[PDB]
Amino acid sequence: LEVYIYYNIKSLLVALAQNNKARFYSKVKLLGLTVDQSTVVYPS
Amino acid sequence: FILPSKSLEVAGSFIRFITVFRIGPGLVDKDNLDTILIDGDSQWGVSK
């Protein structure tokens, strides 16, 4: 069970970190100001 | 987009094309893309 959970965690963490290679700047409205955010899946 | 090219009837000919797709999950290779044109919140990666 521990090896299974480790394997799942390793796959999930690598997948989450891979999303940071496609970061691009957009325009979104936070509060009341339109600002340039930096956006980028999120597997269960 | 299908650029003009020699026909495939004659041997040793290649057809040249460019694909422009909205960026999303699937077969996408950002490193080998020609460029990633950008729109509001939406990308459009064009291939070489």
Q: Where are the beta strands (DSSP E) in B1-48?
A: 20-22, 33-38, 43-47
Taking the CA of residue B6 and the nearest CA in chain A, the distance in Å comes to 36
Resolution of the entry in angstroms: 3.6
B26: region left, alpha or beta (phi > 0 left; psi from -120 to 50 alpha): left
- Measured between beta carbons, the chain A residues lying within 8 angstroms of B23 are 22
Cβ <8 Å between A41 and B36: no
Closest by Cβ to A21, choosing from B23, B25, B30: B30
Q: What's the CA gap between A19 and A26, in Å, rounded?
A: 16
3-state secondary structure of A30: strand
Cβ <8 Å between B38 and A41: no
Tokens 């057809």 appear where?
B15
